[PDB]
C-alpha cells in the first residue's frame, strides 16, 4: 500500500530546481520510503498505546512518536496544519 505516485512525484518535483528531472525508479523508491515512514511512526505509537492500555491511536500519540524518533521538528508544522484544517 502506497500513496499515489503522481502525488509523490509532484511533491518531489517542487523540491528540486525547475530544470531537474526525476527518474521513475526514484519516484517509486520515495513512494516506498513514505509508506515505511508511516508504518515506522505508527509502530512506535501503537506499542505505546498498547502499553498504556488505550484502544485509539490519537494525534498526540503520532506526534510523540515522531518527537521520540528524531522528527521533533515536524510537531509544530503538523499542529498548525491540523488546526487550520479544522478551522
Amino acid at each position: 500500500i502506497y500513496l499515489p505516485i503522481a502525488n509523490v512525484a509532484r511533491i518531489m518535483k517542487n523540491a528540486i530546481p525547475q530544470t531537474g528531472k526525476i527518474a521513475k525508479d526514484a519516484k517509486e523508491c520515495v513512494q516506498e520510503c513514505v509508506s515505511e515512514f508511516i508504518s515506522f511512526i505508527t509502530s512506535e505509537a501503537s506499542e505505546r498505546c498498547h502499553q498504556e492500555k488505550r484502544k485509539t491511536i490519537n494525534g498526540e500519540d503520532i506526534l510523540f512518536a515522531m518527537s521520540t524518533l528524531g522528527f521533533d521538528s515536524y510537531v509544530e508544522p503538523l499542529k498548525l496544519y491540523l488546526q487550520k484544517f479544522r478551522e
Binding site: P4, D25, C29, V34, F37, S46, I57, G59, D61
Partner: protein, 81 residues
C-alpha cells in the same frame, strides 16, 4: 496541496500494524502533512548527490546515499539497500 493526499490510503497503511485497533480522525491528517515534509527533505538531500555526480536526473542511488548519510533516515536502511 496536502489535502489531495487520500486519507483512506494513509489509514490503510496504519492498519497493517498488528497492534492498531482504532485510529483517531486526526491521525491520517497529521500523516498527510508529515508525508509532504518527509518527501521534500528526502528529495532535497538526495539531490545533493545528483549534483555532486554532475547529473540533472535524480536517481534511486542518490536516495540510497542520502539515507546512509542522515541519522533521521536510518529507518530506511532496508527499504533502499
Amino acid at each position: 496541496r496536502v489535502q489531495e493526499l487520500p486519507l483512506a490510503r494513509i489509514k490503510k497503511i496504519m492498519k497493517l500494524d498488528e497492534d492498531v485497533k482504532m485510529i483517531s480522525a486526526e491521525a491520517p491528517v497529521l500523516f498527510a502533512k508529515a508525508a509532504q515534509i518527509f518527501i521534500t527533505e528526502l528529495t532535497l538531500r538526495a539531490w545533493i548527490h545528483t549534483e555532486d555526480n554532475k547529473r540533472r536526473t535524480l536517481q534511486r542511488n542518490d536516495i540510497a546515499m542520502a539515507i546512509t548519510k542522515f541519522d533521521q533516515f536510518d529507518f530506511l536502511i532496508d527499504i533502499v539497500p
